[PDB]
From Swiss-Prot, chain B:
Changing K44N: Lost effector-triggered immunity (ETI) in response to the Xanthomonas campestris effector XopAC/AvrAC in the presence of PBL2 and RKS1. Abolished XopAC/AvrAC-induced self-association. N-terminal amphipathic alpha helix form a funnel-shaped structure that is required for the plasma membrane association of the resistosome complex, cell death triggering, and disease resistance. Belongs to the disease resistance NB-LRR family. RPP13 subfamily. It comes from Arabidopsis thaliana. Disruption phenotype: Increased sensitivity to the pathogenic biotrophic bacteria Xanthomonas campestris pv. campestris (Xcc). Reduced resistance to Pseudomonas syringae expressing HopZ1a. The gene is RPP13L4. The chain holds residues 152 to 251 of 852 of the full protein. Interacts with ZED1/ZRK5. Component of a stable high-order oligomeric complex made of RKS1 and RPP13L4/ZAR1 which recruits ZED1-related kinases (e.g. uridylylated PBL2 and acetylated ZED1/ZRK5) in the presence of ATP and pathogenic bacteria type III secreted effector (T3SE) proteins (e.g. Pseudomonas syringae HopZ1a and HopF2a and Xanthomonas campestris pv. campestris (Xcc) XopAC/AvrAC) to form a wheel-like pentameric resistosome; this complex triggers immunity toward pathogenic bacteria (e.g. X.campestris and P.syringae), especially in vascular tissues. It comes from the Eukaryota. Signal peptide: none annotated. This is Disease resistance RPP13-like protein 4.
From Swiss-Prot, chain C:
CC-NB-LRR receptor-like protein required for recognition of pathogenic bacteria type III effectors (T3E) such as Pseudomonas syringae HopZ1a and HopF2a and Xanthomonas campestris pv. campestris (Xcc) XopAC/AvrAC; this recognition requires ZED1-related kinases (e.g. PBL2, ZRK3 and ZED1/ZRK5). Confers allele-specific recognition and virulence attenuation of HopZ1a. Immunity mediated by RPP13L4/ZAR1 is independent of several genes required by other resistance protein signaling pathways such as NDR1 and RAR1. Changing V1M: Abolished HopZ1a-induced hypersensitive response (HR) and loss of resistance to Pseudomonas syringae pv. tomato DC3000. It comes from the Eukaryota. It is found in: Cell membrane; Nucleus. N-terminal amphipathic alpha helix form a funnel-shaped structure that is required for the plasma membrane association of the resistosome complex, cell death triggering, and disease resistance. The lineage of its organism: Eukaryota, Viridiplantae, Streptophyta, Embryophyta, Tracheophyta. Disruption phenotype: Increased sensitivity to the pathogenic biotrophic bacteria Xanthomonas campestris pv. campestris (Xcc). Reduced resistance to Pseudomonas syringae expressing HopZ1a. This is Disease resistance RPP13-like protein 4. Interacts with ZED1/ZRK5. Component of a stable high-order oligomeric complex made of RKS1 and RPP13L4/ZAR1 which recruits ZED1-related kinases (e.g. uridylylated PBL2 and acetylated ZED1/ZRK5) in the presence of ATP and pathogenic bacteria type III secreted effector (T3SE) proteins (e.g. Pseudomonas syringae HopZ1a and HopF2a and Xanthomonas campestris pv. campestris (Xcc) XopAC/AvrAC) to form a wheel-like pentameric resistosome; this complex triggers immunity toward pathogenic bacteria (e.g. X.campestris and P.syringae), especially in vascular tissues. Transmembrane segments: none annotated. Belongs to the disease resistance NB-LRR family. RPP13 subfamily.
């Protein structure tokens, strides 16, 4: 079946998108040698 | 900076005396280094200003040099500030030439 | 006042300094230097008072 692999794809896609969404506002908040 | 008033400076003649007799023993080492350690706003910069704006010290040392270092700093600005205090022109220049 | 002539005989080195809302210390210092007659030298603050 494609069922088990489709739900594996679902879980890993949703974890990627969730991590992006909750990381992004922290970057929205702040903005930012060797010699001899 | 070494510019102050020396009229509000409430008596520091003992500390000034002791540090002057430390500086008269400069040749007895190879390079005498001294430390003024204390909490914030206690008198460290002003006791240093009271030291090397005296006259015996100015006869002793040819080229007295003040250098301000802060929280925020970089190496090459310290280097060229030493150059300015010596008498070299403030030349836009890089670090390896400065120590030479 | 200080474009009169008696005042210009009185004072050797009259100095105008513009300070505004927006300012910084070292530009005031080097503007005093320019008004005195020193060269506008790229330089830091502790040397300026000396
Ligand atoms: N003996 C003194 N008589 C009069 N004023 C003094 C005396 N000692 C210190 N002051 C004044 C000078 C300054 O206005 C203020 C801060 O002292 P200062 O020497 O600049 O601090 P400090 O060198 O002890 O520490 P820091 O540089 O970290 O602030 O105290």
């Amino acid at each position: 079946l494609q069922y088990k692999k489709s739900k594996r794809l679902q879980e890993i896609n949703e974890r990627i998108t969730k991590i992006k969404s909750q990381v992004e506002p922290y970057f929205e908040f702040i903005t930012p040698d060797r010699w001899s | 900076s070494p510019v102050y008033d020396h009229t509000q400076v409430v008596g520091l003649e003992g500390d000034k005396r002791k540090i002057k007799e430390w500086l008269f023993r400069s040749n007895d080492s190879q390079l005498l280094i001294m430390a003024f350690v204390g909490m914030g706003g206690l008198g460290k910069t002003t006791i240093a200003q009271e030291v090397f704006n005296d006259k015996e010290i100015e006869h002793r040392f040819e080229r007295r040099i003040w250098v301000s270092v802060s929280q925020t700093f970089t190496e090459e600005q310290i280097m060229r500030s030493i150059l300015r205090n010596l008498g070299d022109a403030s030349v836009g220049d890089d670090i390896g030439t400065l120590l030479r």
